[PDB]
Ligand binder design. Structure first.
Ligand SMILES: Cc1ccccc1CNC(=O)C1(C(=O)O)CC1
Ligand SMILES: Cc1ccccc1CNC(=O)C1(C(=O)O)CC1
Lengths: 237, 300
């Protein structure tokens, strides 16, 4: 069924599960043509497939060649997403396959259910959470590898860096969603917050800076202020 | 013309015969129905005056035997029986005909309604949906479940309609997921028509039988089957042109016959708006669209 704020702890139990977000699969720029019409130009996208307990991110890069000569691309993108998630599940050993897949957008339910007919024991669920996974393209290292891709490619990341050494996956997911919500609400200011201090760096094998426990509290507080600030700017509050 | 005689009418009951209905009073001198047109299946159905629970009835074909109705006071229902002594049967019917205790199937000669609702319905195919091989006639009632309904509870008392499930491996070729889910032509033509039904007439016969069981008994699973079979055709981009023309005729007469006051419970808004206005065949059902728009404009 639908995943929400009542059964929130289910995300961090021992049943393997993946979130799938398709909001960056089909990406375009819109521009005027010489004749004054409007044309779109696709750019590389990505499927965001995340194990919320472990932080493992299966970033499938969607190269613009997959759209070549296809029609109704927004619809195709949901089915291409479902096709790639299904192939990912099939490539995993049985004991690593998820027991549930949670789609962030309800329009993915039927495409994924149909591609996963061979897996009748894997539950495909929507969620009532509004998750900021679209902002994944605001993470520099992920945006880089997507835009440099010359062919389809799967890149693997731990989106929690080494946080699980010190915090629970409940807390790490909460830190992630607050970071992504801030990047989505005011990307420039969020990045200012994250990288204003040169003394704090990002390890080559990480996505985020190497903050101490106390620095993460400061950073998290600054992200909450950014969100509140933007909320007041928006609504004149 | 053939006859369905009645031993008696000990309990007050509304009797239907195909699309017609009438009332019989408790212990009224009623001994059945005459002048039933040879050449079609028929259904004789019942709703007790003192308990509108259970509509029940019998599908039969007078070419396959001599059938009478007798009330059984133990099971509490009018039961269809076969009489193998033809001479005894002709003698009992003649006596009831001479005493004018039989009503007449009131068929208007200009009216082809029943033919139009049962064009593709054959007794041999009814008997494979309703399994009770010792009888030549088939009992159906309001509560009987379908095989598909049971998959999601006594299999002897089930309606074995062909299972249709759009999100099933049967409907969806591995490697053609998007194609087969948005265009059901594979499922319609290869799986169902070529594979299971063998021809469109047999498909239309099940569709027509499902509609009639929904209408005459309020059988919910039959209504589901009727709508599923419509949706499968309308959701297919490739259908024989003769199939669509005939479907338009079939649906027109079903919508024409439907009680106006039962529209809220026999018609699925989602299915009909999709079929008439969004589907591949949204333009191939002109007669059905016109009667639906003039008769049930609310549903749309
Ligand atoms: C007395 C009787 C006997 C057998 C069958 C029907 C009737 C009466 N019912 C009708 O005549 C009609 C109907 O819609 O039912 C046609 C109008
Ligand atoms: C109606 C009918 C038609 C065919 C066969 C049986 C019946 C019911 N049998 C009778 O009503 C009687 C009998 O002795 O059987 C009393 C005459």
């Amino acid at each position: 069924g639908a995943m929400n704020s009542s059964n929130y702890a289910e995300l961090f139990n021992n049943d393997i599960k993946l979130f799938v977000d398709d909001t960056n699969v089909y990406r375009v720029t819109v521009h005027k043509t010489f004749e004054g019409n409007v044309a779109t130009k696709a750019i590389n996208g990505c499927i965001f497939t995340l194990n919320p307990k472990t932080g493992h991110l299966f970033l499938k890069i969607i190269h613009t060649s997959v759209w070549a000569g296809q029609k109704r691309l927004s619809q195709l993108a949901k089915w291409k997403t479902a096709e790639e998630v299904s192939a990912l599940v099939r490539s995993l050993p049985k004991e690593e396959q998820p027991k549930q897949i949670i789609v962030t957008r309800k329009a993915m339910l039927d495409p994924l259910e149909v591609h996963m007919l061979d897996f009748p024991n894997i539950a495909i669920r929507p969620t009532e959470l509004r998750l900021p996974f679209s902002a994944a393209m605001s993470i520099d290292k992920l945006s880089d590898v997507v835009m440099k891709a010359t062919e389809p490619q799967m890149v693997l990341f731990n989106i929690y860096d080494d946080w699980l050494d010190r915090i629970s996956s409940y807390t790490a997911f909460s830190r992630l969603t607050l970071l992504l919500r801030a990047l989505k609400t005011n990307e420039e200011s969020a990045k200012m917050i994250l990288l204003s201090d040169p003394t704090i760096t990002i390890k080559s094998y990480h996505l985020w800076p190497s903050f101490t426990d106390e620095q993460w509290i400061t950073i998290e507080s600054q992200m909450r202020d950014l969100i509140l600030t933007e909320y007041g700017r928006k609504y004149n509050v | 013309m053939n006859t369905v005689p009645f031993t008696s009418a000990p309990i007050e009951v509304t009797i239907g015969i195909d699309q017609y209905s009438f009332n019989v009073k408790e212990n009224q001198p009623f001994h059945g129905i005459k002048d039933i047109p040879i050449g079609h299946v028929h259904v004789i159905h019942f709703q007790h005056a003192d308990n509108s629970s259970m509509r029940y009835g019998y599908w039969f074909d007078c070419r396959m035997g001599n059938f009478y109705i007798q009330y059984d006071p133990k099971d509490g229902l009018y039961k269809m029986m076969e009489e193998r002594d033809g001479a005894k049967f002709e003698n009992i019917v003649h006596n009831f005909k001479e005493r004018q205790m039989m009503v007449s199937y009131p068929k208007i000669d200009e009216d082809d309604t029943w033919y139009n609702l049962t064009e593709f319905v054959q007794m041999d195919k009814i008997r494979k949906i309703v399994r009770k091989d010792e009888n030549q006639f088939s009992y159906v009632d309001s509560s009987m479940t379908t095989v598909q309904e049971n998959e999601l509870s006594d299999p002897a008392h089930s309606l074995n309609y062909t299972v249709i499930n759009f999100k099933s491996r049967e409907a969806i070729r591995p490697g053609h997921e998007m194609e087969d889910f948005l265009d059901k032509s594979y499922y319609l033509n290869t799986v169902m028509l070529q594979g299971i039904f063998k021809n469109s007439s047999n498909y239309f016969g099940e569709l027509q039988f499902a509609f009639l069981n929904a209408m005459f008994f309020g059988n919910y699973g039959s209504s589901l089957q009727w709508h599923a079979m419509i949706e499968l055709i309308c959701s297919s981009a490739t259908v024989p042109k003769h199939m669509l023309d005939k479907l338009d005729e079939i649906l027109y007469y079903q919508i024409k016959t439907l009680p106006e006051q039962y529209s809220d419970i026999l018609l699925n808004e989602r299915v009909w708006n999709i079929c008439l206005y969004s589907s591949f065949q949204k333009n191939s059902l002109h007669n059905t669209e016109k009667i639906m728009e003039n008769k049930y404009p609310e549903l749309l």
